[PDB]
């Protein structure tokens, strides 16, 4: 009376090694499998599945993959161990605070081990700390880490990556527009790979992200726990335009046999502060939609204030990101300014010594980019933090797993169990 | 999140079952402050217990109310017992014995 069926539609929650698929890059996209030109999406009918974006294994796996790719891209590049020395730094030739650039001279090792060369370089003030003699400096990372120059030819541009599960597994995309993030989601679908998820690292603002379709969406693991960040998703993007107006030519200094160090030389033009602009009339009423959706959770009588970052590292007090290959840190004190009962120029500071993933011992020297860098990105969300009659919502971030929870919230890996045993009125 | 804990003073004898009512609507924790030694965690969440804490302490959830049933009350329980849901802590009841 028992009957065995192979090919049954049954699945169980599971975790597997998802691989990549994609259509000189840090995230090794050339090595990815060629993705399907037309992805096959099978709308599953009548089926309800219980999702949980905050316990998603895809997010942790993507975090590990991004860190591993960053490590492997830095493996064959130059080691700037010699660059940690005392630097005689003057101010760059300027009238004007603006100590933001320092003209620093040092004795570098040449191709010959028994010779030395007097060279110079423009270093940002955030990349040099003062020792002692008042003109003597050193790179910020010398007393905590070893610095490895990023290869000038590998790009930091986020190329979309499609996370495909192996055969015998599947990914369940929840198509419900109003998705609180967890719980049961009707109208499930099966996909072979996730959508193109750009690996965009940033804090206080999700850039080049996927937008909600129906409404602004507020997603927090617990809206009562302050330690949990509040991921806000925008139904319409807010365009943000950057410029690094400095020309910033580069210059190769041979630090050893077959090892070059690309240093900033003279600036061709005016020494101007970098910035990114956000439209005022859009960012307002974007915060309008956000405060409506926050008052939904916090009651209608609350006063939803938006303050700027309380403190911490530079990576989380400012909207940090990578634009045109240079690492920007924008103030965003004017963005997060209102009580909520023409452009907004946000001044940004560039750094070259970057310690990604909150690590020590793996700092890197982004080489200077020639020309003039510009962003045209689209703010599709925020990472807020509530303060423990009124509720204040400061920015947050730093943990990049929250940056990829906003992308891998629909998806949910499952393991297809094809065997089934049912009673029927048949015998061998 | 709203909390309440009654009574404020409570005297009991040795070898007694004594309950401290404490109503809340969040993940609740129970502590033991010995007047100048910093609190100690006894019961985390409603009912779960901590290492180094004997079974003399125990907790029970019922809708919204929490008990902290301290059976076989020993002389070493002369402390102050307070609740905590996230950032909100109420004054603890001063066990007298």
């Amino acid at each position: 009376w028992v009957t065995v069926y192979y090919g049954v539609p049954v699945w169980k929650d599971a975790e597997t090694t998802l691989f990549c698929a994609s259509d000189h890059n840090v995230w090794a996209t050339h090595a990815c499998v060629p993705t399907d030109p037309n992805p096959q999406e099978i709308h599953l009918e009548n089926v309800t599945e219980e999702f949980n974006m905050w316990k998603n294994n895809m997010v942790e796996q993507m975090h590990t993959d991004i860190i591993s790719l960053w490590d492997q891209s830095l493996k064959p590049c130059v080691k700037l161990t010699p660059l940690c020395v005392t630097l005689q730094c003057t101010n760059v030739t300027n009238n004007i605070m603006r100590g933001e650039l320092k003209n620093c001279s040092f004795n570098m090792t040449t191709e010959l081990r028994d010779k030395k060369q007097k060279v110079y370089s423009l270093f940002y003030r955030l990349d040099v700390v003062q020792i002692n003699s008042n003109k003597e400096y050193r790179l910020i990372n010398c007393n905590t880490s070893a610095i490895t120059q990023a290869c000038p030819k590998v790009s930091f541009e986020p190329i979309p990556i499609h996370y495909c599960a192996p055969a015998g597994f599947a990914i369940l995309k929840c198509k419900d527009k109003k998705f609180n993030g967890t719980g049961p989601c009707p109208s499930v679908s099966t996909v072979q790979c996730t959508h193109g998820i750009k690996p965009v690292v940033s804090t206080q603002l999700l850039l080049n992200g996927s937008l909600a379709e129906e409404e602004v969406m507020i997603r927090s693991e617990n809206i009562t726990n302050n330690a949990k960040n509040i991921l806000v998703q925008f139904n319409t993007p807010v365009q943000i335009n950057c410029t690094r107006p400095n020309n910033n030519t580069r210059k190769s200094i041979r630090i050893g046999p077959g090892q070059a160090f690309y240093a900033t030389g003279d600036i061709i033009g005016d020494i101007r502060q970098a910035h990114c602009n956000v439209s005022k009339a859009t960012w307002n009423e974007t915060l309008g939609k956000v405060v409506k959706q926050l008052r939904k959770h916090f009651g209608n009588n609350t006063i939803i204030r938006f303050a700027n970052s309380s403190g911490g590292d530079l990576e989380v007090t400012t909207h940090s990101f990578n634009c045109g290959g240079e690492f920007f840190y924008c103030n965003t004190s004017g963005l997060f300014n209102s009580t909520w009962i023409d452009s907004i120029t946000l001044p940004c500071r560039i750094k070259q010594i970057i310690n990604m993933w909150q690590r020590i011992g793996q700092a890197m020297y982004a080489p200077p980019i020639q020309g003039v860098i510009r962003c045209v990105s689209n703010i599709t969300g925020l990472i807020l933090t509530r303060d423990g009659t009124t509720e204040t919502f400061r920015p947050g971030g730093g943990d990049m797993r929250d940056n990829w929870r906003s992308e891998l919230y629909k998806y949910k890996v499952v393991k297809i169990e094809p065997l089934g045993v049912a009673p029927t009125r048949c015998k061998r | 999140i709203q909390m309440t804990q009654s009574p404020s003073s409570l005297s009991a004898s040795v070898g007694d079952t004594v309950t401290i009512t404490c109503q809340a609507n969040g993940y609740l924790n129970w502590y033991q402050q010995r007047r100048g030694k910093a609190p100690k965690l006894l019961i985390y969440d409603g009912s779960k217990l901590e290492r180094g804490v004997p079974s003399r302490f125990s907790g029970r959830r019922w809708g919204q109310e929490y008990n902290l049933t301290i059976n076989n009350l020993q002389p070493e329980d002369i402390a102050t017992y307070f609740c905590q849901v996230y950032e909100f802590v109420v004054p603890g009841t001063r066990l007298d014995l």
Partner: nanobody, 121 residues
């Protein structure tokens, strides 16, 4: 073992500033927020605020905005982690014992606290 060694009791005057140190050791300090609380004389506990050990992002209530400053400092390889609590516009109201505790899960279980630091104004 898990240890939050606090600093000695300090005395200040109204207007001056006080610093309270919470040198932490014996575990992975990164995965667990450090919360600061304040026991007034003969009162309950009051929430001063948490600091993230990874990013350093502080979080204080409306009372201590622009007033308290939670900072950290990690030594080499993050093995030691000194957490500092600074106050600026100090008053006689703020005479209390400042404890530092380790939130150890989503339930806000403070299984370990500090010895305490009696700030008297």
């Amino acid at each position: 073992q898990v240890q939050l060694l606090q600093s000695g009791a300090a005395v200040t005057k109204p207007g001056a500033s006080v610093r309270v140190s919470c040198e932490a050791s014996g575990y992975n300090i990164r995965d667990y927020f450090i919360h600061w609380w304040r026991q007034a004389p003969g009162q309950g506990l009051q929430w001063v605020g948490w600091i993230n050990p990874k990013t350093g992002q502080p979080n204080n209530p409306r009372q201590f905005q622009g007033r308290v400053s939670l900072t950290r400092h990690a030594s080499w390889d993050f093995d030691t982690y000194s957490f500092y609590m600074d106050l600026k516009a100090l008053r006689s109201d703020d005479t209390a014992v400042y404890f530092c505790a380790r939130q150890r899960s989503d339930y806000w279980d403070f299984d370990v606290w500090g010895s305490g630091t009696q700030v008297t104004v």
